[PDB]
Enzyme design. Structure first.
Site, PDB file in Angstrom:
ATOM      1  N   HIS A   1     -41.842  -5.272 -21.480  1.00 50.98           N
ATOM      2  CA  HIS A   1     -41.549  -4.242 -22.689  1.00 50.98           C
ATOM      3  C   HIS A   1     -42.546  -4.456 -23.827  1.00 50.98           C
ATOM      4  CE1 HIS A   1     -39.617  -7.788 -24.459  1.00 50.98           C
ATOM      5  NE2 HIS A   1     -38.789  -6.944 -25.662  1.00 50.98           N
TER       6      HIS A   1
ATOM      7  N   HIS B   1     -42.467  -5.182 -27.008  1.00 52.22           N
ATOM      8  CA  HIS B   1     -42.396  -6.039 -28.352  1.00 52.22           C
ATOM      9  C   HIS B   1     -43.263  -7.226 -27.991  1.00 52.22           C
ATOM     10  CE1 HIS B   1     -37.716  -5.047 -29.348  1.00 52.22           C
ATOM     11  NE2 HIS B   1     -38.672  -4.045 -29.910  1.00 52.22           N
TER      12      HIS B   1
ATOM     13  N   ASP C   1     -43.013 -10.592 -27.901  1.00 53.22           N
ATOM     14  CA  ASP C   1     -42.773 -11.640 -27.092  1.00 53.22           C
ATOM     15  C   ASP C   1     -43.200 -11.466 -25.611  1.00 53.22           C
ATOM     16  OD1 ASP C   1     -40.364  -9.831 -26.970  1.00 53.22           O
ATOM     17  OD2 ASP C   1     -38.789 -11.458 -26.618  1.00 53.22           O
TER      18      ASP C   1
ATOM     19  N   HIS D   1     -32.144  -3.012 -24.155  1.00 51.73           N
ATOM     20  CA  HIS D   1     -32.529  -3.632 -25.118  1.00 51.73           C
ATOM     21  C   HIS D   1     -33.828  -2.621 -25.867  1.00 51.73           C
ATOM     22  CE1 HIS D   1     -34.663  -6.738 -27.620  1.00 51.73           C
ATOM     23  NE2 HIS D   1     -35.842  -6.570 -26.793  1.00 51.73           N
TER      24      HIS D   1
ATOM     25  N   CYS E   1     -35.855  -9.254 -21.605  1.00 53.05           N
ATOM     26  CA  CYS E   1     -35.222  -9.143 -22.853  1.00 53.05           C
ATOM     27  C   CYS E   1     -33.964  -8.353 -22.520  1.00 53.05           C
ATOM     28  CB  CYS E   1     -35.737  -8.691 -23.963  1.00 53.05           C
ATOM     29  SG  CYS E   1     -37.057  -9.918 -24.389  1.00 53.05           S
TER      30      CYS E   1
ATOM     31  N   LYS F   1     -28.777 -10.056 -21.045  1.00 51.05           N
ATOM     32  CA  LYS F   1     -28.362 -10.746 -22.344  1.00 51.05           C
ATOM     33  C   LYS F   1     -27.105 -10.948 -22.004  1.00 51.05           C
ATOM     34  CE  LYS F   1     -31.915 -10.144 -25.264  1.00 51.05           C
ATOM     35  NZ  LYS F   1     -32.079  -9.078 -25.788  1.00 51.05           N
TER      36      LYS F   1
ATOM     37  N   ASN G   1     -31.436  -8.641 -30.558  1.00 46.51           N
ATOM     38  CA  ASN G   1     -32.107  -7.682 -31.426  1.00 46.51           C
ATOM     39  C   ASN G   1     -31.829  -6.314 -31.127  1.00 46.51           C
ATOM     40  OD1 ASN G   1     -33.744  -6.303 -33.175  1.00 46.51           O
ATOM     41  ND2 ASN G   1     -35.666  -6.778 -32.127  1.00 46.51           N
TER      42      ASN G   1
ATOM     43  N   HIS H   1     -34.319 -15.090 -22.999  1.00 50.51           N
ATOM     44  CA  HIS H   1     -33.581 -15.753 -24.151  1.00 50.51           C
ATOM     45  C   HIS H   1     -32.493 -16.641 -23.598  1.00 50.51           C
ATOM     46  CE1 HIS H   1     -36.533 -13.216 -26.848  1.00 50.51           C
ATOM     47  NE2 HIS H   1     -35.874 -12.412 -26.351  1.00 50.51           N
TER      48      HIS H   1
HETATM   49 ZN   LIG Z   1     -37.558  -7.436 -27.076  1.00 51.48          ZN
HETATM   50 ZN   LIG Z   2     -36.905 -10.666 -26.758  1.00 50.06          ZN
END
Ligand SMILES: [Zn+2]
Ligand SMILES: [Zn+2]
Length: 214
Positions: free
Chosen positions: A71, A73, A75, A133, A152, A155, A161, A191
């Site tokens: 994705h 983001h 990270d 996410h 991400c 979860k 987030n 995570h």
């Molecule tokens: Zn993310």
């Molecule tokens: Zn993440």
């Protein structure tokens, strides 16, 4: 900040963990081997850690042949710019690339338009379950190993987030993912700790819970 960690999960599969007024984010990705060629599943959370990762693999005799970001983001994508400078092929969905561009971030070199896409036939497969996410989140399936990298999107402890999340779509997306990858032996997430296919169910429960609370 703790140092980049590289831990062998099994033959041809390594988990990379990198770290970055909140505090500190722990981020897991994979490196997957096809013969002596290595493919990053998500870049580390910084450009420097991406360089360290690549160098470790090069210094153990592996050729870094590509990276796929799950994705937009940082990270999943921090290392794309540096990888492009090394002529290492970077991949992301067209939606992910559109979101990178919208944020004035460096795009992957290569992209794909479909819900299902084979990065390498029968070895590294990409799937879009739907928004969760983020709007663009995809997962990476390793058919030979029966390992899912959920990034991400999975979860199982809490959704984390929500800034770019789609709460109304996440439960449906999560059910789609559960149906498709019940076959998964291991589910690796960005995570949380590694688990089995039940983490897909856990994720659906957290998405439902989180949507109700909103
Ligand atoms: Zn993310
Ligand atoms: Zn993440």
């Amino acid at each position: 900040l703790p140092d980049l960690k590289i831990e062998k999960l099994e033959k041809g599969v390594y988990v990379h963990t990198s770290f970055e007024g909140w505090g500190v984010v722990t981020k897991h990705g994979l490196v997957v081997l096809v013969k002596n060629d290595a493919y990053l599943i998500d870049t580390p959370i910084t450009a420097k850690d991406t360089e360290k990762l690549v160098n470790w693999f090069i210094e153990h005799g592996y050729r870094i042949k590509g990276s796929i970001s799950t994705h937009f983001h940082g990270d999943s994508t921090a290392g794309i710019e540096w990888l492009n400078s090394q002529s290492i092929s970077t991949y992301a969905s067209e939606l992910t690339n559109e979101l990178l561009k919208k944020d004035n971030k460096v795009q992957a070199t290569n992209s794909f338009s479909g819900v299902s896409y084979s990065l390498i036939k029968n070895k590294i497969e990409v799937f879009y379950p739907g928004p969760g996410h983020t709007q663009d989140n995809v997962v990476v399936w390793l058919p030979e190993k029966k390992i899912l990298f959920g990034g991400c999107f999975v979860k199982p402890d809490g959704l984390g987030n929500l800034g770019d999340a789609n709460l109304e779509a996440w439960p449906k997306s999560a059910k789609i993912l559960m149906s498709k990858y019940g076959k998964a032996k291991l589910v690796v997430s960005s995570h949380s700790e590694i688990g089995n296919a039940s983490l897909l169910q856990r994720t659906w429960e957290q998405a439902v819970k989180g949507l109700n609370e909103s």
